[PDB]
């Protein structure tokens, strides 16, 4: 579902997959090949949400922001895990937010970074590119390996392929 | 959406805002200007849920309770953050439950208290009023400042304004 | 709702309770008297999900799995708490996953085990039967008492009875 808020209707690319039970409200922009999964809520009322190209927002997640704080800005080929809370933060390209994590206002996650499952990235926290960061409050643990970087090169692209299988549902018996 | 459970139909004030995807079941009472957000579940089957005036229950949250344990009692002008799990506990007026927190059966949160995001308030835990409490397990950190009290004086009221802007 | 994915239709027992707002997709099998609560998502697209008999999956939870990793296999009379994330793991009979917990790929929870609320069981972790395990990352704390075993013997049964009252 797409809902209007004041003078704002969501701007959703024609190639974006939106699963059932989703609510996208107001000032939300979602780029090509991005894919939004079951029961996710993307609420752009008090502030804006922008999602780039080829990014997945997984099931039961919530995206929001705060009046007068940073907008929610998510780059390209990002993976946001199931049941995440993404709140007024910036996430760089190719990064992965582990399922069940919480990212608070004005935080920034560099590109090609893994946030471990169940992490809490607190307000204003700055996380560099190419690291593993995890815990509550989350801390930078180590640099990613070449294999982990390669995994991030393609994790979102596999979700794009998965979402195309759903977009062609009416082309399957 | 409201659902009957046995003999119980939800008692929702005429001015309560309820977003889409919400399921409110059974013995649930919600007061004037309270506002319930997308995909929240308020399940009053095994015990009662009561929410006062001007309280927000944010998106993807779950409110439930347990047999023979404490009902869920939430006061006025309370903020319950996104994806919280609120279970058989008492929450005093003007308090804020940080997003993604879990509050277990028989816990009590005093009035004018902030629970930090991602906290776990354990069973039977009593958190005093006018403090910041955070962590898993959650611990009292310090008393709130008057600026934080003033924030709590208005956080729920700004949510009321927000809900009215949807023009339901 | 039971959504088809490619050639996979969910196989749901006639006695399985499924609440409103639920999305069950693809290669998902759910057995007799199991009960799936409001807004839960059970997504069997990249891998399968199997749930036995008398098991509850509570509100706002998500079950999923990963390509090339272990399927999600949940036994009989299991309790999965509200807003849990259950991912490519095996859960033994009569176990209880405390609300808001996360179980990652290839983990195994032994039967008659309690995972404390808000816990994280990491990938490939094998939790023995008949213990309490809690924390993030979760650790085994102690063996369960007879009182707690009795509680696990009745927890899912109470959810079966609750679901039938709907
Ligand atoms: Na719509
Ligand atoms: Na829904
Ligand atoms: Na959640
Ligand atoms: Na790891
Ligand atoms: Na993607
Ligand atoms: Na609505
Ligand atoms: Na909050
Ligand atoms: Na509890
Ligand atoms: Na096919
Ligand atoms: Na714990
Ligand atoms: Na730890
Ligand atoms: Na059950
Ligand atoms: Zn918010
Ligand atoms: Zn419950
Ligand atoms: Zn997954």
Residue numbers in the entry:
A (entry chain A): 1 to 173
B (entry chain B): 1 to 168
C (entry chain C): 1 to 166
What does the paper say about this structure?
Activity assays showed that γ‐CaCA possesses very low, but detectable, anhydrase activity, while exhibiting no measurable esterase activity. Differential scanning fluorimetry (DSF) revealed that the enzyme shows high thermal stability with a melting temperature (T m ) approximately 65–75°C in the pH range between 5.5 and 9.0. The structure of γ‐CaCA was determined by X‐ray crystallography at 1.11 Å resolution, the highest resolution reported so far for a γ‐CA. The enzyme was crystallized as a trimer in the crystallographic asymmetric unit and contains three zinc‐binding sites, one at each interface of neighboring subunits of the trimer.
The 16S microbial community profiling of a metagenomics library from geothermal spring at Lisvori (Lesvos island, Greece) enabled the identification of a putative sequence exhibiting 95% identity to the γ‐type carbonic anhydrase (γ‐CA) from Caloramator australicus (γ‐CaCA). The sequence of γ‐CaCA was amplified by PCR, cloned, and expressed in E. coli. X‐ray crystallographic analysis of the γ‐CaCAmut structure at 2.1 Å resolution, provided detailed structural insights into how the mutations impact the overall enzyme structure, function, and thermostability. These findings provide valuable structural and functional insights into γ‐CAs and demonstrate a strategy for converting an inactive enzyme into a catalytically active form through rational design.
